Amino acid sequence: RPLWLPGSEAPKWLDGSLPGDYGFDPLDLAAEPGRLNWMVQAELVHCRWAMLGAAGIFIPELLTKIGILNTPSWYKAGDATYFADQGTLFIVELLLMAWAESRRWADIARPGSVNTDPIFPNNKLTGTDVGYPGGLWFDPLGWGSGSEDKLKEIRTKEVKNGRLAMLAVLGAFVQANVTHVGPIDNLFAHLADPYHTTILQSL
Amino acid sequence: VAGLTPCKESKGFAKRQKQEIKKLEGRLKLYAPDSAPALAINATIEKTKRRFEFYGNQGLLCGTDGLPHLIVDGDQAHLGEFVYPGLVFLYIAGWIGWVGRAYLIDVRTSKKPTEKEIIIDVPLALRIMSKGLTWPVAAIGELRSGKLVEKSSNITVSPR
Amino acid sequence: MQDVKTYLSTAPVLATLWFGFLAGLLIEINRFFPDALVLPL
Amino acid sequence: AHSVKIYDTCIGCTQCVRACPTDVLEMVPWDGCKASQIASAPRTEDCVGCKRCESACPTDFLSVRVYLGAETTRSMGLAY
Amino acid sequence: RPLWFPGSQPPEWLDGSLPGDFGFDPLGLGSDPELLKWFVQAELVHCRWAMLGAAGIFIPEALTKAGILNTPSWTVAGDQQYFTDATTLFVIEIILFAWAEGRRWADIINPGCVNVDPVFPNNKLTGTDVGYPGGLWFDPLGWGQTGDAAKLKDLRTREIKNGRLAMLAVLGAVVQANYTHTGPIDNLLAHLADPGHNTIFAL
Amino acid sequence: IGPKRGSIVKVLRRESYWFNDTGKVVAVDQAPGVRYPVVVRFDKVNYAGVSTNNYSPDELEQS
Numbered sequence: 001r002p003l004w005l006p007g008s009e010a011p012k013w014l015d016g017s018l019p020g021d022y023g024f025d026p027l028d029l030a031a032e033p034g035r036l037n038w039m040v041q042a043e044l045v046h047c048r049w050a051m052l053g054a055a056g057i058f059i060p061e062l063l064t065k066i067g068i069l070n071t072p073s074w075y076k077a078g079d080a081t082y083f084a085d086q087g088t089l090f091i092v093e094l095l096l097m098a099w100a101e102s103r104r105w106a107d108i109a110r111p112g113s114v115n116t117d118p119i120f121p122n123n124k125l126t127g128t129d130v131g132y133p134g135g136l137w138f139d140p141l142g143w144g145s146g147s148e149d150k151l152k153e154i155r156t157k158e159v160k161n162g163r164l165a166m167l168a169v170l171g172a173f174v175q176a177n178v179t180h181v182g183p184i185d186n187l188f189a190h191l192a193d194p195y196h197t198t199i200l201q202s203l
Numbered sequence: 204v205a206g207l208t209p210c211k212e213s214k215g216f217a218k219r220q221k222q223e224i225k226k227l228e229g230r231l232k233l234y235a236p237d238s239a240p241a242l243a244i245n246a247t248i249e250k251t252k253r254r255f256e257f258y259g260n261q262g263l264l265c266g267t268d269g270l271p272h273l274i275v276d277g278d279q280a281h282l283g284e285f286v287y288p289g290l291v292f293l294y295i296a297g298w299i300g301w302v303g304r305a306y307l308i309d310v311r312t313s314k315k316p317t318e319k320e321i322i323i324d325v326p327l328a329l330r331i332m333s334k335g336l337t338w339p340v341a342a343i344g345e346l347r348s349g350k351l352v353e354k355s356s357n358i359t360v361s362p363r
Numbered sequence: 364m365q366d367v368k369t370y371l372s373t374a375p376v377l378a379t380l381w382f383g384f385l386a387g388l389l390i391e392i393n394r395f396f397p398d399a400l401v402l403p404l
Numbered sequence: 405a406h407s408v409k410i411y412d413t414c415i416g417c418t419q420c421v422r423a424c425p426t427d428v429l430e431m432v433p434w435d436g437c438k439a440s441q442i443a444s445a446p447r448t449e450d451c452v453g454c455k456r457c458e459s460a461c462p463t464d465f466l467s468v469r470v471y472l473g474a475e476t477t478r479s480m481g482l483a484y
Numbered sequence: 485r486p487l488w489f490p491g492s493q494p495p496e497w498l499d500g501s502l503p504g505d506f507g508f509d510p511l512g513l514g515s516d517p518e519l520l521k522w523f524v525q526a527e528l529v530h531c532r533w534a535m536l537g538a539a540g541i542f543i544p545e546a547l548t549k550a551g552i553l554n555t556p557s558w559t560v561a562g563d564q565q566y567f568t569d570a571t572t573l574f575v576i577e578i579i580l581f582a583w584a585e586g587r588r589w590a591d592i593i594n595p596g597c598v599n600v601d602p603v604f605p606n607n608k609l610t611g612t613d614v615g616y617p618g619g620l621w622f623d624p625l626g627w628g629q630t631g632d633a634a635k636l637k638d639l640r641t642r643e644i645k646n647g648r649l650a651m652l653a654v655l656g657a658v659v660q661a662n663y664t665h666t667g668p669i670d671n672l673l674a675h676l677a678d679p680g681h682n683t684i685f686a687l
Numbered sequence: 688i689g690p691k692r693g694s695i696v697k698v699l700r701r702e703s704y705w706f707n708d709t710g711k712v713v714a715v716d717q718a719p720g721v722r723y724p725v726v727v728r729f730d731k732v733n734y735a736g737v738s739t740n741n742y743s744p745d746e747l748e749q750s
């Protein structure tokens with residue numbers, strides 16, 4: 001398999017079964033037995049929150065540049081008023097995040113336990129692997145089932161698109177901190193003068 | 204906060220800027236204006252004026268002495284006085300504590316463990332000094348897995 | 364270098380080379396960023 | 405004067421007697437070690453209390469043990 | 485075997501197998517076999533950068549004196565203004581040499597591992613020795629891949645000895661600029677007029 | 688007697704320097720009447736600088 005560094009030995013824990021495995025654990029953050037089960041679940045929420053993050057940071061800002069949404073910038077979106085209080089929407093989120101993540105917390109701890117419904121137990125999730133809750137609510141098209149070689153490719157495509165979005169969202173964060181311009185305008189200021197709009201010029 | 208005026212509007216803090224340049228300007232009066240020691244005092248004045256314009260722009264609190272005071276309680280205005288450089292420090296200090304702890308584990312399973320502390324194995328040292336970058340994820344990871352602490356049955360204890 | 368680098372890897376030389384680099388770094392931080400009482404970041 | 409006590413951890417290495425500068429310790433026969441000898445302190449009234457025997461005892465913890473008690477002209481080391 | 489000091493005994497670590505080996509090790513810093521292979525690799529890129537250095541110092545300044553080109557002096561060439569700032573010219577070069585020298589870093593550590601092009605796996609370098617990569621990108625004429633080893637060693641000896649003259653020359657150009665404050669072609673023509681007086685002791 | 692020669696034991700003697708420490712048995716005396724027959728060698732010295740000490744089998748457990 002290809003690795004993150006040619007001529008470097010792959011670690012004994014990353015053996016190449018996991019989708020997206022390029023032997024990249026230089027600091028040994030997943031060495032310990034039982035630890036790599038937690039770090040895949042951590043990678044999967046972070047990659048999917050970043051692909052949700054990149055679709056809310058770049059896509060409404062790109063369509064603002066075209067001018068068919070007129071949405072405000074994401075770093076000034078916390079100052080925008082809504083039908084609810086901005087402080088109130090935090091706690092309503094973390095009451096709903098208290099439900100959705102603790103159902104996810106029990107799946108990492110005890111797999112195959114919380115696939116059944118808390119209310120109407122005929123509705124059961126069809127997901128078998130940890131971190132892939134297949135069911136009508138999450139995978140209505142049934143794209144998460146098939147051959148293991150076919151399933152590994154689409155799980156490789158989640159995390160390779162997911163690691164790009166993590167780098168993307170981490171980039172927009174630092175761009176809005178030192179330049180105070182939204183990141184689609186940072187792209188359009190880089191296609192005009194690329195050698196004068198660089199991280200050293202923005203300090 | 205705590206009876207302290209901000210340093211940008213403190214009359215005592217502006218008085219200390221006035222009497223510091225005036226001390227350095229009187230030092231400049233006995234030198235030629237293009238001389239080499241006069242360039243050092245001219246660089247000292249610009250270092251002083253950079254310092255006073257930096258302290259007032261960070262929201263520092265100045266007392267009745269005209270001196271910037273640090274609020275270390277954890278105020279949302281005052282994070283860079285104690286909380287922000289404290290978290291910067293503890294990351295660096297935990298980096299020192301994690302690569303010195305991981306070096307001792309790496310040399311305890313060696314042929315002569317005491318010759319690797321007077322003569323520090325630099326390829327063994329430098330391969331874990333890079334690994335001390337991500338140390339809160341490795342210290343609490345060893346704490347949760349039980350590898351951080353040693354059980355008291357295997358610890359040398361002085362008798363009662 | 365089987366023994367010259369062993370002498371260079373001893374405790375006083377590596378303390379001199381690290382603290383020479385450490386005080387060399389902290390002086391050069393204190394030149395381009397002097398009088399630093401508050402971390403702005 | 406000083407009370408020098410020998411314990412059963414002794415290996416009969418004899419170096420407590422060899423380090424003694426006032427001839428307190430002697431090696432008596434014994435059945436509790438490979439050397440088949442243990443130290444004893446018959447002339448413990450001649451003990452200065454210097455604990456050279458405790459410095460030369462290789463047993464952890466020490467087999468010879470000197471307890472500084474009542475001090476007389478023997479254990480003060482005077483010539484006047 | 486030609487040697488630098490014909491009465492002296494050659495060192496044990498310099499057995500003459502290396503190209504350009506003349507037994508010159510009075511301080512003996514290449515005594516360790518693991519450090520000798522690093523220092524030969526250090527001397528190869530030092531030789532080729534100085535020959536590339538000597539063609540940018542002594543070749544265009546000779547054309548500057550002859551009026552062929554109007555290029556500035558090599559000491560003040562970095563001070564000139566370009567379309568890219570010289571602070572951000574470095575980080576373009578540092579990024580481009582993290583792929584050039586970082587992939588060269590793996591070849592010194594693990595020989596025969598970075599010889600395959602990652603974008604297209606059919607392209608590969610026709611090289612077997614460390615420090616001489618071969619292939620179409622580095623040896624397009626095929627002169628460095630010969631069946632006979634005596635001609636191949638002499639051609640690598642020709643590369644080293646041409647290199648170490650330039651490492652004297654670029655170091656010679658540095659101290660001449662610090663002492664005379666004059667271009668080394670102009671120092672040559674001043675020395676070609678009156679070589680008795682126009683020297684380092686001309687002050 | 689003794690646990691084993693060449694085995695790893697842990698000292699239960701309270702007054703030793705190597706209490707709750709890993710030691711290697713180098714000699715067990717099989718002569719009767721010996722109070723402390725098991726000779727245990729340690730990787731670390733005590734304050735006297737020695738690493739060789741004699742313990743009874745009741746003051747050691749296999750670890």
Ligand code: CLA
Binds near residue numbers: 649652656682685
């Ligand atoms: C490739 C090697 C080389 C060459 C051919 C030159 C040539 C020249 N140098 Mg020199 N120089 C060299 C390297 C070189 N140098 C090195 C390594 C240093 C650093 C010590 C200097 C520093 C230096 C100073 C500071 C000055 C010269 C000057 C001169 C000129 C007058 C001669 C003189 O006084 O020499 C002085 C020579 C030395 C100080 C060092 C000896 C040079 C090498 C190491 C020995 C010979 C090597 C090799 C056998 C040369 C082959 C020549 C061949 C092609 C014919 C002359 C054109 C002077 C000038 O500008 O003239 C007007 C001047 O002031 N040189």
Ligand SMILES: CC1=C[C@H](O)CC(C)(C)[C@H]1/C=C/C(C)=C/C=C/C(C)=C/C=C/C=C(C)/C=C/C=C(C)/C=C/C1=C(C)C[C@H](O)CC1(C)C
Binds near residue numbers: 508513514536557558
């Ligand atoms: C071996 C030995 C033996 C034992 O060990 C002892 C001893 C004695 C130690 C030894 C010896 C040593 C020596 C002699 C050394 C030296 C070296 C050198 C001089 C190098 C250089 C080296 C050098 C080099 C690389 C160089 C490089 C260069 C360059 C890049 C340049 C560039 C440039 C150009 C083009 C031009 C422009 O306009 C500018 C610039 C940009 C500037």
Ligand code: SF4
Binds near residue numbers: 413419467468
């Ligand atoms: S020195 Fe200690 S172990 Fe040796 S004979 Fe005397 S009392 Fe026994």
